[PDB]
Amino acid sequence: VYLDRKLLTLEDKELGSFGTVKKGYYQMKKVVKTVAVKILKPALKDELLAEANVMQQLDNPYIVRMIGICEAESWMLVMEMAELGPLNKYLQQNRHVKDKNIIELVHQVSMGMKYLEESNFVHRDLAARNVLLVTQHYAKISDFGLSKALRADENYYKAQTHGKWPVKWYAPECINYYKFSSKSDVWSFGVLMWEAFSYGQKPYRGMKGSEVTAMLEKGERMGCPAGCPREMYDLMNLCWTYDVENRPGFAAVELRLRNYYYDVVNEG
Ligand SMILES: COc1ccc(Nc2nc(-c3cccc(C(=O)Nc4ccc(C(=O)O)cc4)c3)cn3ccnc23)cc1OC
Ligand SMILES: [Cl-]
Numbered sequence: 001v002y003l004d005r006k007l008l009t010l011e012d013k014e015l016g017s018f019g020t021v022k023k024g025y026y027q028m029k030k031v032v033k034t035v036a037v038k039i040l041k042p043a044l045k046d047e048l049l050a051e052a053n054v055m056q057q058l059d060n061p062y063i064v065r066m067i068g069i070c071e072a073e074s075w076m077l078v079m080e081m082a083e084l085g086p087l088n089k090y091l092q093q094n095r096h097v098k099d100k101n102i103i104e105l106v107h108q109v110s111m112g113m114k115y116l117e118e119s120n121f122v123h124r125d126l127a128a129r130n131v132l133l134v135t136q137h138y139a140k141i142s143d144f145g146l147s148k149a150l151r152a153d154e155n156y157y158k159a160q161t162h163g164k165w166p167v168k169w170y171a172p173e174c175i176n177y178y179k180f181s182s183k184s185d186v187w188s189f190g191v192l193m194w195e196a197f198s199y200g201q202k203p204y205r206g207m208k209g210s211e212v213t214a215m216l217e218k219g220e221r222m223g224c225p226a227g228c229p230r231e232m233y234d235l236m237n238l239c240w241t242y243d244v245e246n247r248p249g250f251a252a253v254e255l256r257l258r259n260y261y262y263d264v265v266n267e268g
């Protein structure tokens with residue numbers, strides 16, 4: 001959890017800019033581990049410790065692993081590096097990634113989210129930008145800064161202060177009632193699917209969050225990305241069921257993705 005600054009080596013170049021993120025290496029006794037280190041500039045510190053507390057409890061092949069936290073020139077969260085980075089950016093720069101490969105990756109995210117659902121955690125920022133690639137065929141979920149462990153007696157988290165929120169990824173019940181459940185995450189996952197099959201295009205382009213709400217309330221949903229297979233667009237639309245009760249969970253979604261992926265595999 002608490003790491004030795006002497007064992008961390010940071011590169012100058014930032015990968016991104018809350019703070020910055022930088023690549024580094026962390027020494028074990030016989031190897032070094034390549035790391036991504038989130039580096040802050042009270043509120044920020046509190047959020048980092050909270051995020052670390054959530055990551056600490058998670059153990060799944062499709063979730064980014066925390067190495068630990070470090071308190072030196074600034075506060076640092078140190079994670080196992082996913083070398084290829086955010087999926088949205090990857091797909092923008094790699095437009096000939098095959099449909100079978102996109103299905104493989106979004107299924108992996110679904111398996112990560114099924115685990116998160118079973119663990120009774122809500123992610124609350126599930127977007128393509130927060131899916132990180134280890135390889136072209138291996139995705140992990142990251143960014144647990146808004147994530148919450150559900151109370152033992154509640155199936156949702158009730159936000160109080162509408163913070164700075166990724167509205168275009170949020171279900172109607174999140175915007176209208178400030179209620180966040182694993183089924184809200186399923187909604188976000190449908191948006192993440194749309195982004196993936198759109199090769200990292202932004203959702204609801206040109207629209208204000210307000211117009212998104214109006215659109216969704218009309219019953220309108222985003223169109224099928226070019227080359228996106230029927231079966232996958234149907235699954236997006238099922239993720240975007242307006243009524244939480246009738247919206248599937250991740251067990252349901254993962255299985256549908258699983259079965260389809262095996263069909264696509266069997267073709268060939
Ligand atoms: C430059 O390419 C990258 C390659 C690997 C990574 N890897 C990793 N990055 C992060 C990380 C943390 C905090 C913030 C960010 C971040 O700034 N992401 C991001 C996502 C999307 C965009 C964009 O759409 O332009 C720009 C930046 C990324 C965490 N991680 C945990 C394990 N591996 C990583 C990041 C890269 O750029 C942001
Ligand atoms: Cl250093």
Ligand SMILES: [Cl-]
Binds near residue numbers: 028029030032
């Ligand atoms: Cl060494």
Ligand SMILES: [Cl-]
Binds near residue numbers: 160
């Ligand atoms: Cl909040």
Ligand SMILES: [Cl-]
Binds near residue numbers: 166167209
């Ligand atoms: Cl947004």
Ligand SMILES: [Cl-]
């Ligand atoms: Cl599999």
